[PDB]
């Protein structure tokens, strides 16, 4: 109820490409063995990684990069999307870091942690097996401290407030996933100008359809996860106008087609 995961199988030297990603919740995810290159497009960095990187995106997000296989054998990309009841009960933990945190910039949406042999241990379980399930309590303080040294780290804000305006903005279109969102309902329905809230799409370098068009692609990939398997279904359902509409922005987005993924979720 609080985490759900993915395991994904990586072929040699397979590439995944990501194009404006919306993260809908907060997701850590890293790779069970050998080598890979992440190549953030956003920042212009890449980075090797192994078993012991955690990749870290931040909520409301929105991701340009890619992951490459550097391994000739597979390799399982491990990923948990973290609910957002679970974050809402971190914050009694990081409360008291508020002095600490307000002088944290806000800038960095995909974090690197390398993990030492304890930390790594517990969030494999996470996605795995253990007769006795960690405690409520053991696990938020594992998350809040893990969080904070991230946070620490980068002198920059993970778990973002509650109040943000990009939040704002999605949760609005995630209450209405179908309707035919133009600018002036954000601005009616916030109670807020367009001079301030375009700067939430700006930073992210999306103009609104690309913005509503990402929401709605990472509904579809929820409802994909749920076991939906009708294309067609899943293209209305996710409130694009046609499969065709679909499927053209699921291929620039993911670089697969719907199908495919369904495959590696489900095949
Ligand atoms: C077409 C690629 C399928 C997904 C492979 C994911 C591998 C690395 C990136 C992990 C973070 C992004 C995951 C998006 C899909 C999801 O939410 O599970
Ligand atoms: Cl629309
Ligand atoms: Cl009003
Ligand atoms: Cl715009």
Same mark, same amino acid.
């Given at each position: ?7 994904? +199988? ?8 990501? %194009? ?5 919740? *907060? ?17 212009? &960095?890449? *980075?090797?990684? %192994? ?22 054998? $597979?390799? $399982? ?10 974050? !809402? ?11 600490? !945190?307000?002088?944290?910039?806000? %800038? ?41 040294? &991230? ?28 309707? $035919?969102? !133009? ?10 100008? !367009? ?13 609104? +359809? ?8 990472? *509904? ?22 046609? &499969? ?10 993911? %670089? &697969?087609?719907?199908?495919? *993924? ?6």
């Amino acid at each position: 109820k609080s985490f759900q995961t993915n395991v994904y +199988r990586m072929s040699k030297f397979d590439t995944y490409i990501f %194009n404006n990603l919306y993260i809908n919740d *907060y997701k850590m995810f890293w790779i069970d063995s050998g080598i890979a290159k992440l190549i953030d497009k956003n920042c212009l &960095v890449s *980075y090797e990684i %192994n078993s012991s990187s955690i990749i870290l995106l931040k909520k409301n997000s929105i991701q340009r990069f890619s992951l490459t296989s550097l391994s000739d054998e $597979n390799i $399982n990309v491990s990923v948990i999307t973290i609910s957002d009841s679970f974050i !809402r009960s971190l914050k009694s933990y990081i409360l008291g870091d508020l002095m600490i !945190r307000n002088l944290y910039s806000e %800038n960095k949406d995909l974090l690197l942690w390398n993990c030492e042999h304890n930390d790594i241990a517990v969030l494999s379980e996470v996605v795995n097996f253990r007769e006795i399930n960690y405690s409520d309590e053991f696990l938020k303080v594992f998350f809040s401290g893990f969080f904070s040294k &991230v946070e620490k780290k980068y002198n920059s804000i993970f778990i973002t407030d509650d109040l943000d305006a990009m939040e704002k903005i999605s949760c609005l279109v995630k209450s209405d996933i179908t309707r $035919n969102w !133009r600018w002036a309902d954000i601005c009616g329905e916030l109670r807020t100008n !367009r001079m301030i809230l375009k700067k939430e799409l700006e930073s992210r370098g999306v103009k609104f +359809r690309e913005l509503i068009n990402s929401i709605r692609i990472s *509904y579809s990939i929820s409802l994909m996860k749920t076991g939906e398997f009708k294309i067609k279904q899943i293209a209305y359902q996710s409130g694009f106008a046609s &499969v065709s509409y679909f499927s053209t922005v699921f291929k620039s987005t993911m %670089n &697969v087609a719907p199908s495919e *993924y369904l495959f590696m979720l489900t095949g």
